[PDB]
Design an enzyme around this catalytic site. Sequence first.
Site, short mmCIF file in Angstrom:
data_model
loop_
_atom_site.label_atom_id
_atom_site.label_comp_id
_atom_site.label_asym_id
_atom_site.label_seq_id
_atom_site.Cartn_x
_atom_site.Cartn_y
_atom_site.Cartn_z
N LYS A 211 0.73 -1.23 -0.04
CA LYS A 211 -0.09 -0.24 0.03
C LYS A 211 0.62 1.42 0.20
CE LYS A 211 -4.39 -1.59 1.67
NZ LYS A 211 -5.45 -1.53 2.57
N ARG A 245 -3.70 -9.61 5.71
CA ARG A 245 -4.22 -9.68 4.44
C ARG A 245 -3.34 -9.39 3.51
NH1 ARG A 245 -6.25 -6.51 0.49
NH2 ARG A 245 -8.22 -7.18 -0.81
#
Length: 266
Positions: A211, A245
Amino acid sequence: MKLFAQGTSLDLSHPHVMGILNVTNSLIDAVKHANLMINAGATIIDVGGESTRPGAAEVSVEEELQRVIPVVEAIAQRFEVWISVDTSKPEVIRESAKVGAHIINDIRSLSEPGALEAAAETGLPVCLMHMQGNPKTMQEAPKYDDVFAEVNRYFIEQIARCEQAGIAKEKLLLDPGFGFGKNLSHNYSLLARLAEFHHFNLPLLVGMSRKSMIGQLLNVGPSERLSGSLACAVIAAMQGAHIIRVHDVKETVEAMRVVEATLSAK
Ligand SMILES: Cn1c(SCC(=O)Nc2ccccc2)nc2c(=O)[nH]c(N)nc21
Protein backbone atom coordinates in the site's frame (compact mmCIF):
# COMPACT_ATOMS: atom_id res chain seq x y z
CA MET A 1 -9.97 -17.35 20.38
CA LYS A 2 -11.92 -19.07 17.53
CA LEU A 3 -14.29 -18.32 14.64
CA PHE A 4 -17.07 -20.66 13.46
CA ALA A 5 -18.54 -20.97 9.97
CA GLN A 6 -19.78 -23.65 7.52
CA GLY A 7 -19.43 -26.36 10.21
CA THR A 8 -15.66 -25.83 10.64
CA SER A 9 -13.58 -23.46 12.79
CA LEU A 10 -10.54 -21.20 12.55
CA ASP A 11 -8.13 -21.29 15.51
CA LEU A 12 -6.75 -17.75 16.05
CA SER A 13 -4.02 -18.72 18.59
CA HIS A 14 -1.38 -17.89 15.95
CA PRO A 15 -1.34 -15.31 13.09
CA HIS A 16 -3.14 -16.34 9.91
CA VAL A 17 -2.14 -15.21 6.43
CA MET A 18 -5.11 -14.17 4.17
CA GLY A 19 -4.15 -14.32 0.48
CA ILE A 20 -5.64 -11.77 -1.94
CA LEU A 21 -7.53 -13.18 -4.95
CA ASN A 22 -8.61 -10.36 -7.29
CA VAL A 23 -11.19 -11.46 -9.89
CA THR A 24 -11.04 -8.71 -12.59
CA ASN A 25 -10.63 -18.47 -18.57
CA SER A 26 -10.83 -16.25 -15.45
CA LEU A 27 -12.22 -19.12 -13.35
CA ILE A 28 -9.40 -21.60 -14.22
CA ASP A 29 -6.77 -19.02 -13.27
CA ALA A 30 -8.38 -17.85 -10.00
CA VAL A 31 -8.55 -21.47 -8.81
CA LYS A 32 -4.87 -21.98 -9.79
CA HIS A 33 -3.88 -18.82 -7.89
CA ALA A 34 -5.91 -19.98 -4.86
CA ASN A 35 -4.11 -23.34 -4.95
CA LEU A 36 -0.64 -21.72 -4.99
CA MET A 37 -1.59 -19.44 -2.07
CA ILE A 38 -2.82 -22.46 -0.11
CA ASN A 39 0.44 -24.35 -0.88
CA ALA A 40 2.36 -21.26 0.34
CA GLY A 41 0.49 -21.45 3.70
CA ALA A 42 -2.56 -19.15 3.30
CA THR A 43 -5.33 -20.37 5.56
CA ILE A 44 -7.84 -17.83 4.20
CA ILE A 45 -8.48 -16.62 0.61
CA ASP A 46 -10.02 -13.12 0.22
CA VAL A 47 -12.14 -13.06 -3.00
CA GLY A 48 -13.06 -9.64 -4.39
CA GLY A 49 -14.72 -8.48 -7.62
CA GLU A 50 -14.82 -4.68 -7.05
CA SER A 51 -11.69 -2.45 -6.90
CA THR A 52 -11.30 0.16 -4.11
CA ARG A 53 -9.05 2.76 -5.86
CA PRO A 54 -10.77 6.14 -6.55
CA GLY A 55 -11.29 5.83 -10.32
CA ALA A 56 -12.58 2.22 -10.00
CA ALA A 57 -15.83 1.30 -11.76
CA GLU A 58 -18.96 0.85 -9.66
CA VAL A 59 -19.48 -2.82 -10.47
CA SER A 60 -23.12 -3.86 -10.92
CA VAL A 61 -24.72 -6.55 -8.73
CA GLU A 62 -24.91 -8.91 -11.76
CA GLU A 63 -21.23 -8.34 -12.78
CA GLU A 64 -20.02 -8.86 -9.16
CA LEU A 65 -22.13 -12.02 -8.80
CA GLN A 66 -20.75 -13.44 -12.09
CA ARG A 67 -17.08 -12.94 -11.12
CA VAL A 68 -17.20 -13.82 -7.37
CA ILE A 69 -19.74 -16.61 -6.79
CA PRO A 70 -18.22 -19.28 -9.12
CA VAL A 71 -14.75 -18.62 -7.64
CA VAL A 72 -16.02 -18.94 -4.05
CA GLU A 73 -17.92 -22.13 -4.99
CA ALA A 74 -15.03 -23.69 -6.86
CA ILE A 75 -12.73 -23.08 -3.84
CA ALA A 76 -15.11 -24.47 -1.19
CA GLN A 77 -15.52 -27.65 -3.34
CA ARG A 78 -11.82 -28.26 -4.05
CA PHE A 79 -10.12 -27.09 -0.79
CA GLU A 80 -10.41 -27.00 3.02
CA VAL A 81 -9.27 -23.33 3.09
CA TRP A 82 -11.45 -20.60 4.63
CA ILE A 83 -12.98 -18.11 2.21
CA SER A 84 -13.42 -14.40 2.81
CA VAL A 85 -15.71 -12.45 0.47
CA ASP A 86 -14.83 -8.85 -0.16
CA THR A 87 -18.22 -7.28 -0.96
CA SER A 88 -20.68 -4.63 0.16
CA LYS A 89 -23.78 -5.99 -1.65
CA PRO A 90 -26.44 -8.01 0.22
CA GLU A 91 -27.05 -10.30 -2.78
CA VAL A 92 -23.38 -11.23 -2.97
CA ILE A 93 -23.25 -11.69 0.82
CA ARG A 94 -26.25 -14.08 0.59
CA GLU A 95 -25.19 -15.98 -2.50
CA SER A 96 -21.59 -16.26 -1.23
CA ALA A 97 -22.71 -17.90 2.03
CA LYS A 98 -24.93 -20.39 0.15
CA VAL A 99 -21.87 -21.61 -1.85
CA GLY A 100 -19.54 -21.89 1.19
CA ALA A 101 -18.02 -18.44 2.10
CA HIS A 102 -16.87 -18.32 5.77
CA ILE A 103 -16.26 -14.57 6.35
CA ILE A 104 -17.99 -11.41 5.13
CA ASN A 105 -15.22 -8.83 4.62
CA ASP A 106 -16.87 -5.49 3.90
CA ILE A 107 -14.77 -2.35 3.65
CA ARG A 108 -18.03 -0.38 4.20
CA SER A 109 -18.97 -2.29 7.41
CA LEU A 110 -22.45 -3.22 6.11
CA SER A 111 -23.51 0.38 5.45
CA GLU A 112 -25.28 -0.49 2.18
CA PRO A 113 -29.11 -0.81 2.31
CA GLY A 114 -29.88 -4.43 3.31
CA ALA A 115 -26.24 -5.50 3.89
CA LEU A 116 -26.68 -5.50 7.68
CA GLU A 117 -29.76 -7.75 7.52
CA ALA A 118 -28.20 -9.97 4.80
CA ALA A 119 -25.02 -10.54 6.89
CA ALA A 120 -27.08 -11.40 10.05
CA GLU A 121 -29.14 -13.97 8.16
CA THR A 122 -26.04 -15.85 6.94
CA GLY A 123 -24.83 -16.25 10.54
CA LEU A 124 -21.23 -15.85 9.27
CA PRO A 125 -18.32 -13.88 10.82
CA VAL A 126 -18.24 -10.23 9.78
CA CYS A 127 -15.19 -7.95 9.53
CA LEU A 128 -15.84 -4.33 10.48
CA MET A 129 -13.31 -1.99 8.79
CA HIS A 130 -12.81 1.72 9.36
CA MET A 131 -12.99 4.07 6.38
CA GLN A 132 -13.43 7.87 6.40
CA GLY A 133 -15.80 8.78 3.55
CA ASN A 134 -15.89 6.41 0.56
CA PRO A 135 -13.28 5.08 -1.92
CA LYS A 136 -13.56 7.77 -4.66
CA THR A 137 -13.05 10.71 -2.30
CA MET A 138 -11.44 9.44 0.98
CA GLN A 139 -7.82 10.28 -0.01
CA GLU A 140 -8.47 13.91 -1.09
CA ALA A 141 -7.94 15.43 2.35
CA PRO A 142 -8.29 12.91 5.21
CA LYS A 143 -8.58 14.67 8.55
CA TYR A 144 -8.76 13.61 12.20
CA ASP A 145 -8.43 15.55 15.46
CA ASP A 146 -7.21 12.21 16.87
CA VAL A 147 -7.18 9.23 14.47
CA PHE A 148 -6.81 6.46 17.04
CA ALA A 149 -9.66 7.85 19.21
CA GLU A 150 -11.93 8.25 16.20
CA VAL A 151 -11.28 4.78 14.73
CA ASN A 152 -11.85 3.44 18.29
CA ARG A 153 -15.16 5.35 18.59
CA TYR A 154 -16.24 3.95 15.20
CA PHE A 155 -15.62 0.36 16.39
CA ILE A 156 -17.76 0.99 19.55
CA GLU A 157 -20.68 2.24 17.46
CA GLN A 158 -20.43 -0.42 14.75
CA ILE A 159 -20.22 -3.29 17.24
CA ALA A 160 -23.44 -1.88 18.82
CA ARG A 161 -25.12 -1.52 15.41
CA CYS A 162 -24.17 -5.15 14.63
CA GLU A 163 -25.48 -6.43 17.99
CA GLN A 164 -28.79 -4.54 17.52
CA ALA A 165 -29.32 -6.47 14.26
CA GLY A 166 -28.68 -9.80 16.08
CA ILE A 167 -25.04 -10.23 14.97
CA ALA A 168 -23.37 -11.50 18.18
CA LYS A 169 -20.10 -9.84 19.26
CA GLU A 170 -18.34 -13.25 18.89
CA LYS A 171 -18.92 -13.10 15.07
CA LEU A 172 -17.06 -9.79 14.64
CA LEU A 173 -13.57 -8.89 13.50
CA LEU A 174 -12.12 -5.35 13.61
CA ASP A 175 -9.79 -3.65 11.04
CA PRO A 176 -8.53 -0.07 11.26
CA GLY A 177 -8.57 0.07 7.45
CA PHE A 178 -5.08 1.10 6.52
CA GLY A 179 -5.19 3.56 3.61
CA PHE A 180 -8.96 4.15 3.79
CA GLY A 181 -9.22 7.89 4.26
CA LYS A 182 -5.80 8.21 5.89
CA ASN A 183 -2.56 10.04 5.10
CA LEU A 184 0.90 8.62 5.80
CA SER A 185 0.95 10.06 9.32
CA HIS A 186 -2.53 8.68 10.17
CA ASN A 187 -1.66 5.17 9.01
CA TYR A 188 1.48 4.99 11.15
CA SER A 189 -0.31 6.35 14.23
CA LEU A 190 -2.76 3.46 13.94
CA LEU A 191 -0.09 0.79 13.36
CA ALA A 192 1.96 2.04 16.32
CA ARG A 193 -1.10 1.79 18.63
CA LEU A 194 -2.71 -1.33 17.06
CA ALA A 195 -2.33 -3.41 20.27
CA GLU A 196 -4.64 -0.98 22.09
CA PHE A 197 -7.57 -2.17 19.91
CA HIS A 198 -7.35 -5.51 21.79
CA HIS A 199 -9.60 -4.11 24.57
CA PHE A 200 -12.62 -5.17 22.46
CA ASN A 201 -11.56 -8.84 22.89
CA LEU A 202 -12.10 -9.36 19.17
CA PRO A 203 -9.89 -10.61 16.34
CA LEU A 204 -7.90 -7.83 14.65
CA LEU A 205 -7.50 -8.10 10.87
CA VAL A 206 -5.09 -5.83 8.99
CA GLY A 207 -4.35 -5.07 5.35
CA MET A 208 -1.20 -3.15 4.50
CA SER A 209 0.24 -5.15 1.63
CA ARG A 210 1.98 -3.08 -1.07
CA LYS A 211 0.00 0.00 0.00
CA SER A 212 0.70 3.70 -0.28
CA MET A 213 1.86 3.93 3.37
CA ILE A 214 4.84 1.82 2.21
CA GLY A 215 5.08 3.43 -1.27
CA GLN A 216 5.39 7.02 0.04
CA LEU A 217 8.01 6.04 2.59
CA LEU A 218 10.29 4.16 0.16
CA ASN A 219 9.34 6.21 -3.00
CA VAL A 220 8.84 3.05 -5.07
CA GLY A 221 6.13 1.39 -7.08
CA PRO A 222 3.81 -1.45 -5.96
CA SER A 223 6.06 -4.23 -7.31
CA GLU A 224 9.00 -3.01 -5.18
CA ARG A 225 7.23 -2.98 -1.77
CA LEU A 226 7.73 -6.49 -0.43
CA SER A 227 10.27 -5.71 2.31
CA GLY A 228 8.09 -2.81 3.53
CA SER A 229 5.01 -5.05 3.38
CA LEU A 230 6.74 -7.73 5.51
CA ALA A 231 7.85 -5.03 7.99
CA CYS A 232 4.21 -3.90 8.31
CA ALA A 233 2.97 -7.47 8.72
CA VAL A 234 5.54 -8.26 11.40
CA ILE A 235 4.85 -5.03 13.30
CA ALA A 236 1.14 -5.91 13.29
CA ALA A 237 1.50 -9.60 14.23
CA MET A 238 3.92 -8.77 17.07
CA GLN A 239 1.12 -6.59 18.50
CA GLY A 240 -1.24 -9.60 18.36
CA ALA A 241 -3.05 -9.03 15.03
CA HIS A 242 -4.80 -12.27 14.11
CA ILE A 243 -5.24 -12.09 10.34
CA ILE A 244 -2.85 -10.39 7.88
CA ARG A 245 -4.21 -9.68 4.37
CA VAL A 246 -1.42 -9.95 1.77
CA HIS A 247 -0.42 -10.39 -1.89
CA ASP A 248 2.83 -12.22 -1.08
CA VAL A 249 1.77 -15.32 0.83
CA LYS A 250 4.94 -17.44 0.97
CA GLU A 251 7.04 -14.63 2.37
CA THR A 252 4.45 -13.38 4.86
CA VAL A 253 3.86 -16.95 6.13
CA GLU A 254 7.65 -17.27 6.60
CA ALA A 255 7.74 -14.01 8.51
CA MET A 256 4.70 -15.09 10.62
CA ARG A 257 6.55 -18.27 11.75
CA VAL A 258 9.41 -16.11 13.07
CA VAL A 259 6.84 -13.90 14.88
CA GLU A 260 5.06 -17.01 16.30
CA ALA A 261 8.34 -18.48 17.56
CA THR A 262 9.08 -15.08 19.20
CA LEU A 263 5.58 -14.79 20.73
CA SER A 264 5.65 -18.41 22.00
CA ALA A 265 8.87 -17.63 23.90
CA LYS A 266 7.45 -14.39 25.50
C1 LIG B 1 -10.59 -5.52 0.45
N1 LIG B 1 -9.57 -4.78 1.17
C2 LIG B 1 -8.62 -3.93 0.67
S1 LIG B 1 -8.51 -3.61 -1.04
C3 LIG B 1 -7.32 -2.23 -1.14
C4 LIG B 1 -5.94 -2.71 -1.47
O1 LIG B 1 -5.56 -3.87 -1.31
N2 LIG B 1 -5.19 -1.65 -1.96
C5 LIG B 1 -3.96 -1.76 -2.67
C6 LIG B 1 -3.52 -2.93 -3.28
C7 LIG B 1 -2.31 -2.95 -3.95
C8 LIG B 1 -1.52 -1.82 -4.02
C9 LIG B 1 -1.96 -0.65 -3.43
C10 LIG B 1 -3.17 -0.62 -2.76
N3 LIG B 1 -7.86 -3.43 1.63
C11 LIG B 1 -8.37 -4.00 2.78
C12 LIG B 1 -7.95 -3.82 4.13
O2 LIG B 1 -7.03 -3.10 4.50
N4 LIG B 1 -8.72 -4.58 4.99
C13 LIG B 1 -9.79 -5.40 4.63
N5 LIG B 1 -10.42 -6.05 5.67
N6 LIG B 1 -10.16 -5.55 3.39
C14 LIG B 1 -9.42 -4.83 2.52
